[PDB]
Amino acid sequence: HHHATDYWQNWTDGGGTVNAVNGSGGNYSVTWQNTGNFVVGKGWNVGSPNRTINYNAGVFAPSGNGYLTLYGWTRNALIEYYVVDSWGTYRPTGTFKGTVTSDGGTYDIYTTMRYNAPSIDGTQTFAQYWSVRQSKRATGVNSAITFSNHVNAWASKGMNLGSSWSYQVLATEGYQSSGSSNVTVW
Structure with missing residues (x-):
């Protein structure tokens, strides 16, 4: 009675080298x-607002800007959302909306906008929903993101996810940096 990950996520823009490995399980x-x-990450092809995402990042060693975050899309409306648990030399922020406490940590709530940016609908103009932890979360242990807490928190701030749910992964995002990571998601 557990529907583990079914979607392998791997996107790059071509810059540098990205040696991503679809591992066991x-x-x-x-x-x-x-x-x-x-x-890059692993998750589910259809995200859920009621899913508790579990993960264990045995390695998360970004040398520069890198994210260890929940990442997913919705359609109608088109929205790209984050739950950033840890990062490298840059903490993503945006328009402050409030805070939410979940899974032992207090996350800041931000909204941003993407302009003529790639999406699951192509080049579009869409809103980004962010929950960014105020402190970096410790890795190497079993961690859970109770996503229904963040969805309710976003909703209480006028941030409403779409009705159609595309993928939803525990991802490693980096930009203009080097590093390595090793994560198991279920």
Whole structure:
């Protein structure tokens, strides 16, 4: 009675080298060097607002800007959302909307806008929903993101996810950096 990960996520813009590894089960690894922008992770093809995402990042060693975050899309409306648990040399922020406490940590709530940006609908103009942890979360242990807490928190701030749910992964995103990570998601 557990529907583990079924979607392998691997996107790059071509900058640098991104050696992403689809490993056994819900485990993946990625080492990247001097890259552009990339998003690699494992998750579910259809995200759920009521899903509790579990993960264990045995390695999350970004040398520069890298994210260890929940990442997913919705359609109608078109929205790209984050739950950033840890990062490298840059903490993503935006328009402050409030805070939410979940899974032992307090996350800041931000909204941003993407302009003529790639999406699951192509080049579009869409809103980004962010929940960014105020402190970096410790890795190497079993961690859970109770996503229904963030969805309710976003909703209480006028941030409403779409009705159609595309993928939803525990991702490693980096930009203009090098590093490695090893994560198991279920």
